[PDB]
Amino acid sequence: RTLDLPIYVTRVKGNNVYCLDRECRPRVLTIDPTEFKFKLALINRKYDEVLHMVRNAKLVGQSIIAYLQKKGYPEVALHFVKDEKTRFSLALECGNIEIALEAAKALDDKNCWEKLGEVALLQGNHQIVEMCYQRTKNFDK
């Protein structure tokens, strides 16, 4: 949490942390089960626990809705995928670009279709490559 004044922590004894500044006016703060529970849960690969944990006292932008798109064998990634970019990312990290094309679509962009199409050729199957490559207009490739 933030206080409205600059301060020094007096020390931590108990759940509270206690502070006093130069003029020595106090601030106290209970250590919360907000940010702490969420990542204690994510570390122990729980996503079901973590959905409740998601609150607007700790949501931010990238600790819940896009920090969870940071596994090269998607786990966290599977859970938050709401952003068309996070969805795109998720797909190359699996190597299954079926989801990529859709994210790539929803990113409204050609570049994504050619790059996922190349990844597609890598998983081995060229039907998926054709479709992408056709709409990026790489008829010659």
Add this chain to the structure above:
Amino acid sequence: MVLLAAAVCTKAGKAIVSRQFVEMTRTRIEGLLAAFPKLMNTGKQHTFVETESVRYVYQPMEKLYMVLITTKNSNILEDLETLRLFSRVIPEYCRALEENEISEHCFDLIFAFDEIVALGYRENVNLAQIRTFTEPPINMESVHMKIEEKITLTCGRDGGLQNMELHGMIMLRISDDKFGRIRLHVENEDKKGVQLQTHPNVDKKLFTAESLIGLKNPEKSFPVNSDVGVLKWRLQTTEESFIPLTINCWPSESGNGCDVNIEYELQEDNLELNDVVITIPLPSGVGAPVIGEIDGEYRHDSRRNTLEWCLPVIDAKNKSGSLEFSIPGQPNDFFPVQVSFISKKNYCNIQVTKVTQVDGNSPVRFSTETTFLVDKYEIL
């Protein structure tokens, strides 16, 4: 606009009086004039100097700059010339430039600015003008006729005709010996729209009944542009033109999603059209579609935000699709669907009843062909 603003400046660090032709540069006007004209527009005693990606043209008068600014340009002579005419007009109002006297005749100068440069285009002014305001082989003989036409249509969901128009010409290619006279007979046309052109060598005949046109054809192929309607005309599709396709669109609110059924109808079953495509648009919050069609291929295309159905050739046919939508906002009005098509008939209904040739024996009308093409064909 090419001319952002026309501005009189004091290099006190402010635009003393200035003109914004259309609401764009309000406060913007003062900051530009205030910084740049102080440095002589950053000039060196050169009339054109460009700074912060804006062309500044100027003339110093005292501690003041009379300034023209553009960020685009149509011609060299022009930018100077509006500034110049301005410089005839400004001492009439303010007796040279000077911030207090410029300030007092904001109205005068400003009005001149609107008059001089209107919507950024440099009009002209003059001190008197300003006043009003502040006051042989015939075995071979064969003939071929090709009628090529495009039809345009705008129609409502109701099926209201709205406007339509057909454009076309009938080209004749003839291999005939000698110079034979030919008479052409065609159906009678009407047109809400207008246009008809006749090739030279076309004669008009007046008959009590029926209309006739006669002409000696040029050999080879030429636009007949005969008389009568003509063999080069714009007829109105509205006037008796058939629209090969009618689209009946039934959108449905499945609830969260939307179900769209598109009905296509063709003329006589026997006739088949080719190159037909129906473009059914979709709303921005697309999700994904599932489309089903008995004939041809149909594909949804994001980006385009349209579902396109293509049919190589059709006796006549229909398609359906279900759409998934996230629902932001409220319901959206539909945009019109367009179609492309080819038909082996003319839907200006031009019929070649008879073309009889003389000066010799019967020629063979080996073939008459009709190519009908879609123009802007739109239905909501």
Add this chain to the structure above:
Amino acid sequence: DKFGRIRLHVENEDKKGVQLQTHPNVDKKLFTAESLIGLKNPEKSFPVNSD
């Protein structure tokens, strides 16, 4: 049985006079050609009052 979706297709009407009422659970579909209405019917008898 179950809850089935039904689509109704009818001819197109015009009216010099005026009046039309739709039962709830009636959805309107927009199609390029033809008009369509879809709805989950209440079981038993009810006024359709489709779109």
